[PDB]
Amino acid sequence: DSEKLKEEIGKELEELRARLLPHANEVSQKIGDNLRELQQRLEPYADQLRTQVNTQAEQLRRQLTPYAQRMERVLRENADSLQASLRPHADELKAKIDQNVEELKGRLTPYADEFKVKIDQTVEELRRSLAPYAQDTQEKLNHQLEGLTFQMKKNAEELKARISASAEELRQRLAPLAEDVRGNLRGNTEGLQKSLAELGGHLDQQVEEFRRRVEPYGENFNKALVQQMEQLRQKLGPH
Amino acid sequence: AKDSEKLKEEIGKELEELRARLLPHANEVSQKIGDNLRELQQRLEPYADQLRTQVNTQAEQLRRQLTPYAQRMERVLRENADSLQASLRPHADELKAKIDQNVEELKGRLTPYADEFKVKIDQTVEELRRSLAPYAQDTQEKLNHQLEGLTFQMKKNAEELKARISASAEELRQRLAPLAEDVRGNLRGNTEGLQKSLAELGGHLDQQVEEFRRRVEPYGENFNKALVQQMEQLRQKLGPH
Numbered sequence A: 001d002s003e004k005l006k007e008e009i010g011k012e013l014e015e016l017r018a019r020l021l022p023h024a025n026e027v028s029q030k031i032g033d034n035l036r037e038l039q040q041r042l043e044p045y046a047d048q049l050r051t052q053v054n055t056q057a058e059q060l061r062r063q064l065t066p067y068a069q070r071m072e073r074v075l076r077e078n079a080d081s082l083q084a085s086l087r088p089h090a091d092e093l094k095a096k097i098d099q100n101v102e103e104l105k106g107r108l109t110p111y112a113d114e115f116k117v118k119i120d121q122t123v124e125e126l127r128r129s130l131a132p133y134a135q136d137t138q139e140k141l142n143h144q145l146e147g148l149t150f151q152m153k154k155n156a157e158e159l160k161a162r163i164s165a166s167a168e169e170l171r172q173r174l175a176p177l178a179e180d181v182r183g184n185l186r187g188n189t190e191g192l193q194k195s196l197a198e199l200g201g202h203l204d205q206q207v208e209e210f211r212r213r214v215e216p217y218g219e220n221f222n223k224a225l226v227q228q229m230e231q232l233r234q235k236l237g238p239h
Numbered sequence B: 001a002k003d004s005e006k007l008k009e010e011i012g013k014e015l016e017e018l019r020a021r022l023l024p025h026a027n028e029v030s031q032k033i034g035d036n037l038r039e040l041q042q043r044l045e046p047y048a049d050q051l052r053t054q055v056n057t058q059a060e061q062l063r064r065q066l067t068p069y070a071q072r073m074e075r076v077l078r079e080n081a082d083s084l085q086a087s088l089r090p091h092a093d094e095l096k097a098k099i100d101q102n103v104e105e106l107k108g109r110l111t112p113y114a115d116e117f118k119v120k121i122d123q124t125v126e127e128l129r130r131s132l133a134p135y136a137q138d139t140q141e142k143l144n145h146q147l148e149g150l151t152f153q154m155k156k157n158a159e160e161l162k163a164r165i166s167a168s169a170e171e172l173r174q175r176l177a178p179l180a181e182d183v184r185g186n187l188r189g190n191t192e193g194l195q196k197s198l199a200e201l202g203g204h205l206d207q208q209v210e211e212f213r214r215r216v217e218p219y220g221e222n223f224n225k226a227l228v229q230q231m232e233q234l235r236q237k238l239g240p241h
Helices: A004-133 A138-183 A189-214 A217-236 B004-011 B013-110 B112-135 B140-185 B194-216 B219-238
Strands: none
Touching: A004 A138, A004 A217, A004 B013, A004 B112, A004 B140, A004 B194, A004 B219, A138 A189, A138 A217, A138 B013, A189 B013, A217 B013, B004 B013, B013 B112, B013 B140, B112 B140, B112 B219, B140 B194, B140 B219
16 A cells, blocks of 8 residues: 555666666766756755845844833833822821821810819919908918919829820821831832821821820829819818 | 928928918818819819810821822822823734734745745756656656656655744744733733833843744755755665665
8 A cells, every 4th residue: 555655666766777777877967967056046045045034033023122112111101100190199198297296286285274274263263262261371371372273283284295295206106107108109019009008007006096195184184183182172171 | 211201291381381270160171172172173074074085086087187198199009000001002902913913924025935945946857857858768757757756755845844934933923922911911900010021021022033033044954955865865866876
């Protein structure tokens, strides 16, 4: 089948060779000549195929390379544009932390001041109710009551000071969170996103620390003033 | 030591004197102080209560005022990511399209050479037949058949060259297309990410194009070699030994 149709090729070639046998040298020479002519004919095309491989591969690069170049440029321009768009909001956050901590402070300190008013009102009434019992030694009564007014008001001033010092600690704890976000405008989008996704949580933790610390103050000082007045009652009253 | 007791008795010396004056009324005075202490509590209470409330209300207001900044910055960041994706997508789509279009242009400019080899084979074999015919008289049919067989074997090598050029242009296409696909997949949701694929893109295109160029460059000479060996085989078979 397949082996027989290979023998036929050999057989026929052997027969052609047998016919050409008396001219084997001439025939070998004519084949050698045609082989050189083949090489000469194929040569410019074999050479140009190699050149065209290099020319085409080069053309394909010159055509495709501008796309990566254009996309690299869009990416850089965008990163600049993003930074320019984000910076104003990052500066406004930093500014609002400071402005809102002062507003918080300013809405809390009036209470400490109002305590000073209620101390004055109460001591003046105490003086009026104690005056009939010390009509000749009113100087001593006044001095002792002025002394009490001072001691009581010093507690109201301490409340105001502790509120202010705690609002300031809150400011010094919130400001770095705004700096961290601002520092990440320069750098990776992931770093910026992590600081932005975590910002709210970190603000809460710090605000909660302030609220936890300042919340007891009002009741604490109310009891302090009461102790002061109760101390006077026990000192001046019966044994 | 123990002189704190001495110091404590010096400070309240005037208070001891005020007490000595109030002594006959100690009960009345204690009562009037107790009354004022209740009035004090009553007066301080709403402010002490409101201070506690306001601490909570203000701390909450600070939180609500600062939160929109992280929210606005997240919005600027997403609007930008949308804008970047919309700016990059046209170029990303055009790169994908040009890879395919330019690989076909490349293929179509290289295959004509293998076809031209088929022309040069025909010309050469026809000349070989003309130069061998005087020696094979009454045997032209054996000569022609053997030369047709040689023409076929030689042209099958030219057709293999055309096939290898096409298969290599296709390997180049299958190596360049994923680079465009990878970029096209990183346009949004991954920036670390897209920044890496974009910065590396040009370099990766070059490496693949160079691999094609390096593989296909020897082909022409290799095939030329093969045709020569075929004609040399005929010379050795038909010649003296």
